[PDB]
Amino acid sequence: EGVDISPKQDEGVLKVIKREGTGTEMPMIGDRVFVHYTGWLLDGTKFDSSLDRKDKFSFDLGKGEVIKAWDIAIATMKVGEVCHITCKPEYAYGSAGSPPKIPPNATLVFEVELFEFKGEDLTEEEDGGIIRRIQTRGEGYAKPNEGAIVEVALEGYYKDKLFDQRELRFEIGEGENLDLPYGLERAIQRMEKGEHSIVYLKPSYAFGSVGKEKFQIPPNAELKYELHLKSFEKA
CATH class of the missing domain: 3.10.50.40 (Chitinase A; domain 3)
Structure with a gap:
């Protein structure tokens, strides 16, 4: 049956x-x-x-x-x-x-x-440091690279608390100047145009032992980003 x-x-x-x-x-x-x-x-x-x-x-x-x-x-x-x-x-x-x-x-x-x-574990180490769940598959095969100008819409959570909500146009390689953790910018490079995903970051690929006082993130925090890759110009 x-x-x-x-x-x-x-x-x-x-x-x-x-x-x-x-x-x-x-x-x-x-x-x-x-x-x-x-x-x-x-x-x-x-x-x-x-x-x-x-x-x-x-x-x-x-x-x-x-x-x-x-x-x-x-x-x-x-x-x-x-x-x-x-x-x-x-x-x-x-x-x-x-x-x-x-x-x-x-x-x-x-x-x-x-x-x-x-x-999906995106890390080369396979240490579970950057995990992606896809919410909606994107449109076509192109993925952002070093120097790509991306438009994204993001929401960062520390447990149930929303700390960062922004729509931004930035260059891949410059995100470190915009309070974006390494692990998220890395993961953006595994996303297709139109894709919506949740990215889970371990402390190491996030803000580590130091944390980020301006976002009220304590030391050793795992973080969750809900993000849309809306579009991008490459190189």
């Missing part, structure tokens, strides 16, 4: 909710999702599962690390939701199937529980 949740409206992913999740947020492209699952064939045979394993299955959504039907279905899930999805071969393992466990031209059924998702 299930409703058609395929973009093409071709009945290739069908979804039943078994248990409603909580909150409103759902995974976006780039986010790291943590799931438990089991897969059956139309004859009832279990072919794969994660529950035998001591850990949860995790992957980046939208980057093609899972089958197409999973990318589609999970973007419709809330944290704590358990759903059943029925996947036509077009959106699964196709005509070849998957040599041993999965037969040719198979329609697959998964039980999937969404446990947790956090944002």
Whole structure:
């Protein structure tokens, strides 16, 4: 059973909710999702599962690390939701199937529980110092570089408190003169025109041990910026 949740409206992913999740947020492209699952064939045979394993299955959504039907279905899930999805071969393992466990031209059924998702780690260190959650994907591939003139609209939060709200036109490489933390200016360079995102900064990529008295930011503060990259001229 299930409703058609395929973009093409071709009945290739069908979804039943078994248990409603909580909150409103759902995974976006780039986010790291943590799931438990089991897969059956139309004859009832279990072919794969994660529950035998001591850990949860995790992957980046939208980057093609899972089958197409999973990318589609999970973007419709809330944290704590358990759903059943029925996947036509077009959106699964196709005509070849998957040599041993999965037969040719198979329609697959998964039980999937969404446990947790956090944002894309933009750091080269992979130290979690700059995390991005996308709110709206931008328009086209161009990303700002050193010397690019950007127009942005920003809101900085320290816990629930708003400390900085500004719309600004500035040059990438000059943001340090405008009370913008390194980590935010860095992240701006990973955004596409039109993009709206939340950027989470650890103290090191923010204002560090010193903090910023003029914004009432204490030492060792994690910060959250809601930001729009509205436009930019490059080099």
